[PDB]
């Protein structure tokens with residue numbers, strides 16, 4: 001009944017829905033109700049879209065950031081096919097007309113009733129775009145594959161849609177009573193408190209008295225703060241730190257206002273979190289491990305039933321050479337000049353605002369309500385924790401609504417991590433993510449995985465769980481599609497555990513042949529087959545190809561899973577790598593950033609022929625990596641095996657020999673330039689991102705000639721110099737030991753790549769600052785965000801970074 005769905009949702013999201021109920025938290029219950037209605041209502045909107053609108057929902061166009069080609073076309077009811085010559089400049093429509101006409105005149109005697117499906121993928125060609133704007137077509141013009149498409153009539157598209165349906169009156173100091181605490185180790189105990197707005201201190205911190213390493217220590221000590229109850233900003237949070245003195249122990253935070261803006265009065269038991277001293281960015285909800293978490297007991301002094309003032313009441317209440325406090329005062333003084341003449345400097349203005357004074361806040365808020373929308377780039381900055389105010393938060397979201405689905409997809413990883421900054425469950429960001437998610441199935445797909453992958457983390461398990469639940473209410477059908485993916489990943493985990501055990505006790509070929517027998521069990525064949533890929537919902541993983549499955553004899557023994565589809569031919573032979581035991585968030589970020597470089601470069605004419613292959617954490621130290629087909633490690637090739645076509649007289653010739661064995665005759669020259677472009681992209685990418693520990697085992701090359709990096713795990717230093725491998729130069733110089741014309745064009749590719757990136761440098765800084773929310777160990781400080789200082793030399797001009805890049809480039813040809 002409705003129980004079945006609840007059951008399925010509990011299984012999918014990784015948490016029983018009953019566990020939400022058992023909290024009897026009215027904030028939790030209001031979220032679920034309000035968001036369910038919101039999400040069910042979008043679902044209602046979806047069920048009645050035009051068939052082309054539904055195409056846009058479920059299969060958003062995959063577009064690239066004249067000269068004719070072969071295309072293969074068939075219809076849905078018949079396996080009869082027609083091969084056409086068309087131009088890369090032709091619209092899908094023209095192709096559909098040539099398809100309809102040749103059908104008409106073979107069955108004996110309208111294109112607007114059709115769309116073109118890519119064979120074996122959840123991808124479609126439609127809209128008024130030349131064919132060469134479609135990613136699948138571009139991937140065929142480079143692979144030399146022939147595009148195979150299927151004429152799908154509007155009637156069976158609608159069949160798909162339908163089957164997928166379902167008070168400033170308070171003078172006194174604000175003060176706390178610190179009653180007592182309880183859990184321990186090991187000396188003397190102190191409780192440091194603190195009033196914060198974001199990570200701006202609302203006032204001076206106050207420590208408690210030194211008390212003995214008693215367990216259940218006691219204080220009753222009233223703590224009064226240097227700020228009045230009427231001057232607490234809406235988003236004020238009180239932060240505690242409990243430590244030992246002759247060593248940190250725990251921290252815990254909370255909002256002084258509830259989620260209904262009612263200022264908090266009464267007793268609070270604060271279930272604390274373990275430590276590294278005050279941690280304002282930390283979550284405002286208590287440690288769920290109540291059986292063993294230290295708890296701090298406090299009392300919140302009553303003051304009368306007061307609510308934070310409504311917005312109406314709030315509202316009724318040389319400058320250039322900046323783009324020091326005397327400086328800070330000029331900006332606030334000249335704040336009207338900001339709005340009307342420097343609207344995008346809003347961030348800087350908000351940072352000089354006095355958040356501990358309600359009149360200053362009301363003034364700023366009044367300006368904020370008249371403030372014109374900002375560019376996406378400005379808005380990305382405003383989402384950071386250093387802009388905690390809810391109205392600012394909303395303004396930021398409002399400025400983000402013009403995000404295209406392509407950009408939103410690029411930034412989605414960061415928007416999700418920002419959720420960990422929120423103070424309340426119901427928030428504009430959550431509502432925005434959900435809306436976008438319900439309107440674009442690809443967003444929804446990855447929204448889900450970003451949330452599901454962290455459910456093992458107790459500080460976000462609740463929020464993320466609720467969000468996935470609401471989204472499931474918004475698509476009962478996608479939930480089942482998603483369950484299917486989790487069932488496959490559950491089986492891959494079981495299978496991987498067996499391989500870990502078996503390979504320690506027998507040989508690889510024995511483990512492999514029993515990996516195969518495990519896979520051939522019916523529950524495994526069923527679970528592992530006919531699923532959308534979590535790496536890319538548009539990629540369909542049909543028949544699992546057991547005989548080509550294997551595993552790496554390395555480390556975590558990751559699995560190699562191959563698929564084939566008898567309806568895709570070309571685009572159906574694909575593989576995924578399942579890895580359990582490594583943290584993959586790092587790799588995902590890095591590949592995201594490289595993909596964004598690829599976009600920035602490409603949307604300026606420069607195609608460095610990158611390979612941004614998929615990488616998706618799906619669970620605790622668990623995820624998928626997309627297999628890049630027809631590729632090999634530098635290591636395997638430089639191994640210079642006997643017998644092979646690439647066997648060389650000199651080690652430096654192995655790579656170039658390998659390429660020529662893969663690209664005979666004329667074909668070699670394109671492989672060389674591909675190697676060359678891709679080389680320059682990754683050299684610049686790895687230099688800017690600070691990816692070290694680069695070697696022949698983590699660099700690969702495609703038979704096309706394309707070089708790409710894998711297994712990143714580091715970046716930002718956690719300081720790296722530009723890398724130039726002599727064996728690469730040798731390929732670049734087409735083998736000749738002097739070839740300045742080929743070598744200097746390569747030096748050209750690097751510098752332009754570098755300068756393009758240097759222009760959108762702020763974008764990178766904004767995204768990485770947001771990423772700090774993720775708690776990756778390699779991105780924890782200002783010093784990390786600093787490293788992106790030099791790489792991009794954003795302090796300098798023109799380029800007066802001019803010549804940073806010489807030295808690093810000219811140093812790099814040490815090797």
Ligand SMILES: C[C@H](Nc1nc(N)nc(N)c1C#N)c1nc2cccc(Cl)c2c(=O)n1-c1ccccc1
Nearest residue numbers: 551552558559560577613625626627628632633710
């Ligand atoms: C290193 C390589 N990594 C990738 N290989 C491609 N093709 N695409 C990727 N995205 C990545 C990654 N990451 C790789 N990864 C594996 C992962 C799991 C299981 C196996 Cl059995 C392998 C494996 O054999 N190789 C390998 C392949 C060609 C030569 C030497 C070793």
